[PDB]
Structure formats: C-alpha cells, structure tokens
DNA sequence: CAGCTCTGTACGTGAGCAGTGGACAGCT
DNA sequence: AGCTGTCCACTGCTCAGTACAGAGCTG
C-alpha cells in the first residue's frame, strides 16, 4: 500500500495528459504506473530514470523531479501522454485490445495538437504503434528516429528505451541517457531548419 | 526447409523497505 | 556501574521492459 492506500484504490485513479499545441517533444509513456496515480504527477518513481536521463541530457539544465511536470511545456516545450490512459501496474499487465484501442486514441491525439516530435517511451509500444497505425512490421526494429510521421502531419516519431528501471538491457540512466542527448539534438535541428 | 508469429523465460542496477544491532545518553 | 530506552547506521532483501530461444504456424 502507498501511505494506507490500497493498489485497487489506485486502478480506479488516472492520470491527467499534459497536452498543448505547438509543441516541440511530446513523451509518450506506456500506462501510468500506481506511483504515477498516486503522486498524480508523471514519472514520480524513484527509479525511473526519465527524469534523471532529462538532466544528465541537458534538456532540463537543472535537475527536476515529477512535480514540475506541468511546467515542462511552458518552459521547455515539452508534453506527457500515454499509450494506454488506463492505471496499470507493469506491461505485461496489459493486453493486445488495450493497446491497440490506445493506438488510435494516440493518433487521434498526437494529429490534434501536432508537435514537432513524438517520444515514444518504450519498445513495445511503437512495435504495436508502427503494425498498426502504419500496417508496417520491420523486423529488427531499432530505437532513435523512425521512418514514417503520423498520417497527415509533420510530426516525426523517435523511440527510446523505456524510462522504467525494469529493463536489465540497460541498467542505468547512464545508459538511457545516449537518446536523450540525440533527441535533444533532433529538436535543435528541427528548429534550425525551420527558421532556415 | 524457411520464415513468421506467439509464448515463456531470464536478465543489472540502485532506491527504498523492514528488521537488526551497536552506539549512547538519561536514569538510579 | 548497571539498566533501559531512542536513534540511526547498516543489513538483506524486493522491485521498477526487453531480447531471444523455441514451439507452432504458414508459404
Ligand atoms: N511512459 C511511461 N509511463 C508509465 O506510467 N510507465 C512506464 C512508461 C515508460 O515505460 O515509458
């Protein structure tokens, strides 16, 4: 229990996207977690390295925590949705008509407001994002920048490894911390070329 | 065969938890 | 010195997606 409040407490809750318009990045979580229900406030956990890896990258510039997520697309442009709406506990959890419902309501979102780059957050969910909003599945999938926008929009979609600690293939936010730094340097190239 | 999909299985760090015990001040 | 308590340093845990092998497919 989290301070007396029971898990099933938690399922019932959900968590709040941050969305607004002309936005440069948009992260694109999987399913918020219970911390993240509790605290009402994206990527709360003690170990998830998001907001870790958004320090050591530079895109913050100061260290930060899950609180001052509401004032991440005011100052840095920066917004926070998710692949499924639903509370869930891990991914594994999750089934295949979640996420694809999930799928479209994404798209359906991410071609409303339309920012320059959307953050997948994970592997998995691009891989079921790709089959089914594009109805392409590449085998040897990799992370970094992605071949195709979202239909009828501008919007360039990178994936990075999830900012959860579960992952054993990499163990640090020192490891996590490499796409940070290309995604920075992503936004700061689309910048430029557009006031080109 | 060859390739594709599906299921299950195993994998590292470091933060936080309850339990443990040593340090140690306040007593008499 | 002897006893008893709090406090805290420290312990041993447990816990927050991804790659891949192999069974079961289909061409
Ligand atoms: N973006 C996320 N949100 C969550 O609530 N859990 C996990 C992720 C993730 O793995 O990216």
């Known amino acids: 229990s989290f ?50 890896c958004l320090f050591m990258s530079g895109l913050s510039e100061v260290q ?12 840095y442009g920066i917004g926070f949705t998710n692949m499924v709406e639903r509370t ?23 071609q409303k407001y339309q920012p320059r780059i ?24 990799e992370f970094g920048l992605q071949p195709h926008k979202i239909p009828d929009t501008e919007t360039l979609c990178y994936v990075m490894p999830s900012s959860s600690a579960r992952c054993a293939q990499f163990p640090r936010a020192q490891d996590k911390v490499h796409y940070y730094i290309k995604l920075k340097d992503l936004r700061d190239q689309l910048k430029g070329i557009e006031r080109n």
Not at 15 to 43: E, Q
């Open 3 to 52: 301070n007396g409040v029971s898990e099933a407490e938690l399922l019932t809750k959900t968590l709040p996207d941050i969305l607004t318009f002309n936005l440069d990045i948009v992260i694109i979580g999987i399913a918020p977690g219970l911390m993240a229900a509790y605290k009402g406030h994206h990527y709360p956990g003690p170990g998830n390295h998001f907001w870790k």
């Open 88 to 110: 869930t506990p891990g991914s594994k959890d999750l089934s295949s008509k979640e996420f694809r419902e999930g799928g479209r309501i994404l798209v359906q979102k991410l």
């Open 118 to 141: 959307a953050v997948f957050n994970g592997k998995c969910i691009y891989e079921i994002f790709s089959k089914e909003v594009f109805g392409v599945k590449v085998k040897n999938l």
């Open 64 to 75: 930060l925590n899950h609180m001052d997520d509401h004032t991440l697309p005011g100052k």
